[PDB]
Amino acid sequence: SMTEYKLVVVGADGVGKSALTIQLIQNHFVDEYDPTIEDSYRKQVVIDGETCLLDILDTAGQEEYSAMRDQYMRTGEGFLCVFAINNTKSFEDIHHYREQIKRVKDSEDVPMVLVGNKCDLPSRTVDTKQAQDLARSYGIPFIETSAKTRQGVDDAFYTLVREIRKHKEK
């Protein structure tokens, strides 16, 4: 039978959270002038022989009240914490996202993957070693992705599913 995994994608505005989610779900690359409106998306996919239903919240509108977001924070099982490899501030923001997740879940062992997106770009300002060190300090995996080329996209979300399975019976 199907197993449901509730996933939440968080990170600074403009890092490519909608692009990653839409790449995964709809298999095309978005490049929109307009800022993302928060929404959730479902994907059915076989991961390691298990038929999975991924219920994914692409967070956005980060200053505003969202009933749906509150519910995903309550029930969400794993988090993608996304920065952009050409934006040092988005990387510096990761700690605040991680600390918020830890506070709201009241736990240090929440399934999480650190994602460095936009890895297709020639304008890197965050070294892979800095990101690996941060992820090691949190005890979580680090993966680079490009929503533009699809590099690493499936890997990031499937790794998160595998992290959830490592933490709890599914």
């Binding site: 968080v10 600074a12 980060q62 977001r69 924070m73 923001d93 918020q100």
Partner: peptide, 19 residues
């Protein structure tokens, strides 16, 4: 806005305060 509430969550006590 508090740097420690990067994503507004209504039941996070940090988010409900304003500086």
């Amino acid at each position: 806005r508090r740097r420690r509430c990067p994503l507004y969550i209504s039941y996070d006590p940090v988010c409900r305060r304003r500086r």
